[PDB]
Paper text:
Since the recombinant bGalE protein contains one NAD+ molecule per monomer as a noncovalently bound prosthetic group, we prepared ternary complex form crystals with UDP, UDP-Glc, or UDP-GlcNAc by cocrystallization and determined their crystal structures at 1.8–2.0 Å resolution. The electron densities of UDP, UDP-Glc, and UDP-GlcNAc were clearly observed. In bGalE, the UDP moiety is recognized by stacking and hydrophobic interactions by Tyr291 and Leu201, hydrogen bonds by Asp295 and Asn180, and salt bridges by Arg292 and Arg232. The hydroxy groups of the Glc moiety are recognized by hydrogen bonds from the main chain of Lys85 (O2 and O3) and the side chain atoms of Asn200 (O2), Tyr150 (O3 and O4), Ser125 (O4), and Asn180 (O6). In the UDP-GlcNAc complex, the side chain of Asn200 adopts a distinct conformation (designated as “swing out”) from that in the UDP-Glc complex (“swing in”) to accommodate the 2-N-acetyl group. The glucopyranose rings of the UDP-sugars in bGalE are both in the “standard” conformation, in which the H4 atom faces the pro-S side of the NAD+ nicotinamide. The distances between the C4 atom of the sugar ring and the C4 atom of the nicotinamide ring are 3.4 Å and 3.5 Å in the UDP-Glc and UDP-GlcNAc complex structures, respectively. Tyr150 forms a direct hydrogen bond (2.6 Å) with the O4 atom in both the UDP-Glc and UDP-GlcNAc complex structures. Lys154 contributes to the binding of nicotinamide ribose, while Ser125 and Tyr150 form direct hydrogen bonds with the O3 and O4 hydroxy groups of the Glc or GlcNAc, respectively.
GalE catalyzes NAD+-dependent oxidoreductive interconversion of gluco- and galacto-hexoses (C4-epimerization) linked to UDP and generally plays a key role in the metabolism of galactose in various organisms. Group 1 enzymes are further divided into two subfamilies (1a and 1b) due to their separation in the phylogenetic tree. bGalE catalyzes epimerization reactions of UDP-Gal into UDP-Glc and UDP-GalNAc into UDP-GlcNAc with the same level of activity and is categorized into group 215. The dimer interface consists of a bundle of 4 α-helices and contains 8 hydrogen bonds and 4 salt bridges. bGalE has a typical fold of SDR superfamily. The overall monomer protein structure can be roughly divided into an N-terminal NAD+ binding domain (N domain, residues 1–177 and 236–262) and a C-terminal UDP-sugar binding domain (C domain, residues 178–235 and 263–340).
Author numbering:
A (entry chain A), B (entry chain A): 2 to 336
The structure:
Amino acid sequence: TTVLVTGGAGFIATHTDIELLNKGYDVISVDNYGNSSPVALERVEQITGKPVKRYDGDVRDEALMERVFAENNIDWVIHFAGLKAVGESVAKPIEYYDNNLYSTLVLLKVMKKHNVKKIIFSSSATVYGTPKELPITEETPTGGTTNPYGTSKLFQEQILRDVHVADPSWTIVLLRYFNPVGAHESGLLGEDPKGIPANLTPYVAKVAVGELKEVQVYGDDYDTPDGTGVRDYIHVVDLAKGHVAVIDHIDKEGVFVYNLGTGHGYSVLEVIKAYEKAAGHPIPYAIKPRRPGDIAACYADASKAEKELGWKAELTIDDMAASSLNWQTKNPNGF
Amino acid sequence: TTVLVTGGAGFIATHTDIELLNKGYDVISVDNYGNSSPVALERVEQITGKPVKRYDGDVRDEALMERVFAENNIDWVIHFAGLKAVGESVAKPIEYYDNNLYSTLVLLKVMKKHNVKKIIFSSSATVYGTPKELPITEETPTGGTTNPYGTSKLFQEQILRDVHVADPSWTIVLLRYFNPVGAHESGLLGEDPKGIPANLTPYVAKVAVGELKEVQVYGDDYDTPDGTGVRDYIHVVDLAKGHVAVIDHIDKEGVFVYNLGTGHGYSVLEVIKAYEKAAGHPIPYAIKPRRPGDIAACYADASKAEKELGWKAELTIDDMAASSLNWQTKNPNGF
Ligand SMILES: NC(=O)c1ccc[n+]([C@@H]2O[C@H](COP(=O)([O-])OP(=O)(O)OC[C@H]3O[C@@H](n4cnc5c(N)ncnc54)[C@H](O)[C@@H]3O)[C@@H](O)[C@H]2O)c1
Ligand SMILES: NC(=O)c1ccc[n+]([C@@H]2O[C@H](COP(=O)([O-])OP(=O)(O)OC[C@H]3O[C@@H](n4cnc5c(N)ncnc54)[C@H](O)[C@@H]3O)[C@@H](O)[C@H]2O)c1
Ligand SMILES: O=c1ccn([C@@H]2O[C@H](COP(=O)(O)OP(=O)(O)O[C@H]3O[C@H](CO)[C@@H](O)[C@H](O)[C@H]3O)[C@@H](O)[C@H]2O)c(=O)[nH]1
Ligand SMILES: O=c1ccn([C@@H]2O[C@H](COP(=O)(O)OP(=O)(O)O[C@H]3O[C@H](CO)[C@@H](O)[C@H](O)[C@H]3O)[C@@H](O)[C@H]2O)c(=O)[nH]1
């Protein structure tokens, strides 16, 4: 079984690539390295002793995607390629919509043309907006999105649902990830965005090891116990394993929806404290204004994925922080 | 004042082009003639005695759109370019999403780059789905869309709203058209799609003049008085005049929303009867199964546009049918 992994050099993709290769799948990557390094795929190969067939370029490049499908016999696609910062999306809506919607559309066109009709889409807790109830289930209504990123994910979900209406031989798996953190136990791979990290934990990891000065806490006036945002952090290895469980268990047509989270919510301040415990020293932080697009609190009821896929994310916030720092200590400037 | 009219050779665009030119605006067209003829723009020029500067090609062609903006000093854009059949959209979602979303995204990118920040978007009563109340106002909730076409219009509305969040110097006018019908009084221009017409009235006009055999009535089991779909038909000339009223009256930043309809709903059977009255003979029809994506009934409360723009659509269903047949009798195979 061959899996095409778009954005295949990114944070969640590289961890997924490991888990797929360890389970004897063959893996192909396409990535434009806008938020990642080609060295990450070298590390996947190092960890697994298995090849990743690498293509360099943009998922919106129809000629490139045509080559990918013409040169390979692909069974499944996992579509990670996307821009993913809630705050940046509010400021750069067209960059987000172009990248995120048009990558999906070009990919679907090529997949249809080659009759490859099994996709896992990297969707997001952001599709629930300000959650109608907590914890969030797959029955919690979507919509009320607060930022173009989240809107783009909900749009993409609908586009995919409409592909299945028009051709019900498709298998569409909408995985709504919550907030992955951490690194493969080896410390040879981890989260390495380009520029200043937009996500909380890679920023915190850099402050812990002295590569950035001060954690910027975006808002302390949310309707949460300590005022800072609450999220369901999931170890990136657990999330990666979730993808293998889908491909292991779903071999029929249909639209399938799963929340992938732990069910444990942690505030920003609690995350910093988990890193302080892992580092053995204070990590400087400052209270800053709210970031546009952020909501107060979201976390998952992932019962459905446990029942249907046999999968649960049990690595802890301490496992996340420790594995993160292990990577960052060994690789303080990343790749 | 120069207006770029994308889809500028289409049904509603060509009527709008006339009304703009008669009011002393300068008009530029870009169209790929997927559902129209270049001859239509010759007829606009004939009617008005004014030029239409013509570009041939696709709004998704960034190099073409760059040329359009580099070669001309554009004040306003009216974005008509789109695929527009509810039923076809259910069967061809990716064609619809690609054409409709990516044309908009390429256009916005170029407009931003040239600091042209005034747009009228051709939106649709379909954004209301199955209407929460009748008649529909601009306060009627959107969503519940029943077909990828309608979904694509609601998506585009949100993309445009997000452009204004990111740069509130924009003027965004979302015009939700109901169902335009009819032809310029000259009969030298009218509705001329390529292929078998997907809309009701061009099909009915062709059956009336013997160019098609039988009106296909899609469903007679809707929750309406006679069982057939109910719509708010608006004379295409009134709708065209609505666009001039926007540009005449709105010269400030902001997001502005208008329903453009008559407030008079007519069933399919009533439309056929209006054409029979205009033709002076029966027009054969048959009851057929429902078309995917169609809803029972929608019509507009257009009070807001009357107050804010001084505009009302008062041409009648008889004016629509008669002007339609006048065009079709003079041009039985269109252009
Ligand atoms: N918290 C999370 O990190 C989280 C949660 C839910 C969903 N997601 C989604 O999961 C996916 C992956 O997230 P991640 O944390 O691994 O981010 P990431 O930035 O590390 O990975 C995405 C990758 O896609 C690549 N890419 C982006 N657009 C591309 C394009 N047009 N063509 C080719 N390559 C492109 C980037 O270069 C990068 O390697 C994204 O779609 C994201 O929205 C992430
Ligand atoms: N009842 C109606 O007809 C109605 C109601 C509400 C909204 N609308 C919207 O109004 C607009 C115009 O409707 P119309 O009835 O004039 O249809 P139309 O098909 O006559 O006009 C649209 C035009 O756009 C052109 N076009 C389509 N995609 C293009 C692309 N990518 N690049 C260049 N040109 C392209 C076509 O060739 C055509 O000339 C559409 O966006 C439609 O969705 C129509
Ligand atoms: O430097 C930072 C970064 C973040 N935060 C806060 O930390 C929390 C998590 O923020 P972040 O890591 O930016 O993640 P989210 O915005 O919750 O979004 C992530 O999680 C979503 C699913 O929940 C994914 O879809 C997104 O792609 C991914 O970026 C939020 O409360 C932020 O306000 C800070 O205080 N400082
Ligand atoms: O051959 C036909 C065509 C249509 N209908 C019916 O006639 C009505 C109008 O149909 P149609 O002309 O296809 O228009 P709509 O589907 O209502 O959509 C039009 O009106 C929308 C705004 O209401 C626009 O956004 C769309 O682009 C435009 O195609 C509907 O009840 C249809 O079921 C028939 O019975 N036979």
